[PDB]
Amino acid sequence: DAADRAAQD
Amino acid sequence: DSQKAAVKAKQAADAARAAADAAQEAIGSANAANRAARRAAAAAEARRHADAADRAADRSSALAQRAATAAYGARDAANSAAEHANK
């Protein structure tokens, strides 16, 4: 989830 | 088999703890990516952090798989111990 959010950022 | 279960359970605990740390790595990188994105609003940095978070996610997943495997081993050892106790 953090990786996906990081990608969104 | 009881000692085996204790060892495999310990391995599950170690892998699980490592997975928790891997989650913190992914989170830390995600927070850094967010800060970089805020500064951009920096893009190269945010992307590097995203890649790092993705690598952390792969580490966490692999560790969780190892923890599950170790837990399965501990369970099988416990099952054998139960059979031995019954015998």
Cα B42–Cα B45–Cα B51 angle in degrees, nearest 5? 145
3-class secondary structure, B27: helix
Long-range contacts of B36-39 (CB under 8 A, 24+ apart): B36/A9, B37/A9
- Per the structure block, which two tokens stand in for B75? 């369970």
Query: Which backbone phi and psi does B68 adopt, to 5 degrees?
Result: -65, -40
Q: How was this structure determined?
A: cryo-EM
Alpha carbons within 13 angstroms on the beta-carbon side of residue B58 total: 5
Is the torsion defined by CA of B54, B56, B59, B65 positive or negative? negative
- What is d(CA B40, CA B45) in angstroms, rounded to the nearest whole number? 10
**Residues of chain B in Cβ contact (below 8 Å) with chain A:** 23, 26-27, 29-30, 33-34, 36-37, 46, 49-50, 52-54, 56-57
- What is d(CA B61, CA B65) in angstroms, rounded to the nearest whole number? 6
